[PDB]
Amino acid sequence: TDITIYYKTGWTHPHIHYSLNQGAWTTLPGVPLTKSEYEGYVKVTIEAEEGSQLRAAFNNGSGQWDNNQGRDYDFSSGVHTLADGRILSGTPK
Numbered sequence: 201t202d203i204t205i206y207y208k209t210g211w212t213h214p215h216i217h218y219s220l221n222q223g224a225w226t227t228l229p230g231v232p233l234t235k236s237e238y239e240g241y242v243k244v245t246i247e248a249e250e251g252s253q254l255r256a257a258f259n260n261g262s263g264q265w266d267n268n269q270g271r272d273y274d275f276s277s278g279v280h281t282l283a284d285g286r287i288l289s290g291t292p293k
């Protein structure tokens with residue numbers, strides 16, 4: 201149901217800035233990701249109803265962005281890890 205994301209990064213104030221099910225975009229720079237139980241990863245869990253989808257781009261809280269070469273990243277309900285351009289399900293590998 202909720203969208204949970206693990207994101208690999210060295211940035212110290214990483215943010216995910218997203219639009220949930222095609223609605224309003226978050227206010228910039230977005231929602232900050234918290235330090236995770238996995239070396240080099242941060243995590244956020246975005247609350248969402250069944251069958252939800254978000255569009256996201258990630259940033260350092262300041263304008264260095266990771267936006268999947270301008271296309272942004274898509275996520276569905278469930279857990280995912282974004283590592284170096286690539287989404288995989290579940291928690292970090």
Ligand SMILES: OC[C@H]1O[C@H](O[C@H]2[C@H](O)[C@@H](O)[C@@H](O[C@H]3[C@H](O)[C@@H](O)[C@@H](O[C@H]4[C@H](O)[C@@H](O)[C@@H](O[C@H]5[C@H](O)[C@@H](O)[C@@H](O)O[C@@H]5CO)O[C@@H]4CO)O[C@@H]3CO)O[C@@H]2CO)[C@H](O)[C@@H](O)[C@@H]1O
Pocket residue numbers: 217225257265266267270271272
């Ligand atoms: O509101 C209309 C708009 O909404 C959605 O945009 C969202 C983006 O898809 C999402 O990535 C995020 O955008 C970030 C972006 O990732 C980050 O790189 C930075 O953007 C830079 C551009 O990369 C840069 O090229 C330049 O942008 C120019 C753009 O090239 C030109 O084509 C024209 O559109 O003017 C743009 C800006 O005036 O500068 C910006 C920095 O100013 O920052 C972006 C966030 O500020 O967030 C967007 C929502 O905030 C839609 O998906 C998008 O297609 C729609 O047009």
